Amino acid sequence: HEKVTIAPLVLLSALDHYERTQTKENKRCVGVILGDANSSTIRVTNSFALPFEEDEKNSDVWFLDHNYIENMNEMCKKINAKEKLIGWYHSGPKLRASDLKINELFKKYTQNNPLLLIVDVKQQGVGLPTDAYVAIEQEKTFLHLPCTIEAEEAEEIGVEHLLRIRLTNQLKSLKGLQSKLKDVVEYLDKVIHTILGKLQDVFNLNNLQKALTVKTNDELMVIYISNLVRSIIAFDDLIENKIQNKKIQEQRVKD
């Protein structure tokens, strides 16, 4: 499967980037992400800020340092050998048209289809707030890839060291439906395409499921009867514990 694994170091470095560059008014801040992604599983292992300056009435005016990518990459090589160029990061909070022109810059210097990692920095999303995209041909267009945490056995203990189901799943689903609805109302305003095709399809495939849930219930009912037995087996071990206690208690009184 196609997968991205992202270090906490990456995202906390991004957290630091946005304050440490004083980027304000929902402007773009840009850096390079590094790792190993010669394969189709992106492993993101390191990162760096890149000097970036934007104009306040043009975002297609940008200043980005080409020499820095090249020069800092050489320093990266001298330090560890795991820390190759695979992509870049931006502060989001959405995609831009101007994202392409920068993505086009990184394309020469990568050995895979350039990864744009959108790190949201406002921390007002749900779950892992970061969404990962890769530029391919459609013009050129960005496409979502699954983005998940990383682990190194020291690093995960250190993440915890610093800090020391059903309802959620369902809430997040309704949340989705609500968002799908918003988008549709907006489209309807615009009208008076891909989206529509998708909505129709979904519909076709609660209603269709209804009939089959009836079959599931008979199998679930066997499972509940199983539960009934299981409690009784456990109950047997609990009872034993009470007797052992009892013997001790009686002996204690006597002496």
């Binding site: 000097p51 300056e53 104009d55 043009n58 005016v61 200043f63 340092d65 080409h66």
Partner: protein, 197 residues
């Protein structure tokens, strides 16, 4: 001239890969960069220059600020030699590049080659002339071949950005006939009024 950090904007239009100059317009241009770099560098032991493209394939920063000539030349020779000049943007990005400058004692200056005709809005070009002054920056235009088929927007840009010419701007207008481009550029004020030419 004075102590200055220059972003050099080079024009690699479709014009430039064919004759308008001896033998090639691209081959006229290359001799002048070396001469502008040396003219400045010999005056004062502090002076840095950066290189950017307009025409080519969108504005790109080829080279950051440096005091070594080999980098500029190396950057110049990796160019895409055809396209069209993205004037408005080239000035804006160059001004953006200037803020990063290697030393902060220096003045902030753009030296641009204009080889090919332009088509910019006049109202906008004046706003740029004084946004350069939103950030107190100077600009020098080296113009040729525009004066044979189109207007000079660029003079008005020189008059508008204008403050005293120790601080700001020159318009260096070079007749485009045969004769080495650097020499021509020298009889225009940018290799005159120098410390060491």
């Amino acid at each position: 001239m004075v102590l200055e950090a220059t972003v050099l904007v080079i024009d690699n239009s479709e014009y430039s890969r064919n004759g308008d100059f001896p033998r090639t317009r691209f081959e006229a241009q290359i001799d002048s960069v070396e001469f502008i770099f040396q003219a400045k560098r010999n005056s004062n032991p502090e002076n840095t220059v950066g290189l950017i493209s307009g025409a080519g394939a969108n504005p790109r920063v080829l080279s950051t600020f440096t005091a070594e000539f080999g980098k500029i030349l190396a950057g110049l020779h990796d160019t895409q030699i055809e396209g069209k000049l993205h004037m408005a943007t080239a000035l804006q990005i160059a001004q953006l590049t200037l803020k990063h400058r290697q030393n902060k004692v220096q003045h902030q200056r753009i030296v641009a080659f204009v080889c090919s005709p332009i088509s910019d809005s006049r109202d906008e070009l004046i706003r740029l002339a004084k946004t350069l002054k939103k950030n107190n920056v100077a600009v020098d235009i080296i113009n040729f071949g525009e004066i044979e088929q189109n207007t000079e927007l660029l003079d008005e840009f020189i008059a508008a950005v204008n403050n005293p010419q120790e601080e700001t701007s020159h318009l260096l207008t070079v007749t485009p006939g045969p004769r080495l481009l650097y020499e021509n550029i020298a009889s225009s004020p940018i290799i005159l009024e120098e410390g060491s030419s």
